[PDB]
Amino acid sequence: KIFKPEELRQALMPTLEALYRQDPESLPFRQPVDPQLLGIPDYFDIVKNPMDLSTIKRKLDTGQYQEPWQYVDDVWLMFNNAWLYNRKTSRVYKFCSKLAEVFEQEIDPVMQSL
Numbered sequence: 001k002i003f004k005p006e007e008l009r010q011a012l013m014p015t016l017e018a019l020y021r022q023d024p025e026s027l028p029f030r031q032p033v034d035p036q037l038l039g040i041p042d043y044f045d046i047v048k049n050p051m052d053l054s055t056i057k058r059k060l061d062t063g064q065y066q067e068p069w070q071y072v073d074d075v076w077l078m079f080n081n082a083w084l085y086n087r088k089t090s091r092v093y094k095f096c097s098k099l100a101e102v103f104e105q106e107i108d109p110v111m112q113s114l
């Protein structure tokens with residue numbers, strides 16, 4: 001079996017809600033990184049394809065995903081960007097690692113139900 005495109009929001013939104021529920025860990029991920037505002041002006045020199053929770057949520061609300069892998073792909077893009085840009089000792093890097101642990105715990109039982 002599969003999750004059809006029209007089933008994606010109902011099946012996958014709880015995994016995204018679980019990320020948002022992590023506070024403070026999700027806070028650096030809720031909106032697109034604004035390099036000038038955040039005092040990290042080299043961000044787009046390092047990160048080629050930004051991704052954040054608000055973008056994923058909009059795509060999941062508005063039918064922009066056709067298959068589960070596309071949602072999962074954007075989530076890992078968001079995490080990988082943060083592990084790439086931020087130092088291993090940094091708050092954002094460590095928050096990213098916590099969110100990834102939460103994501104794995106939430107997405108695995110959903111995808112393994114198929």
Ligand SMILES: CCOC(=O)c1cn(C)c(=O)cc1Cl
Nearest residue numbers: 013016017020021030054057
């Ligand atoms: C996936 C449900 O969305 C949230 O849980 C959520 C969404 N936004 C846009 C927020 O700013 C905060 C939360 Cl908690």
Ligand SMILES: CCOC(=O)c1cn(C)c(=O)cc1Cl
Nearest residue numbers: 027028029033038082085092
């Ligand atoms: C809202 C504050 O966000 C950040 O400070 C931040 C977020 N991300 C995802 C980064 O990769 C780097 C920073 Cl500095």
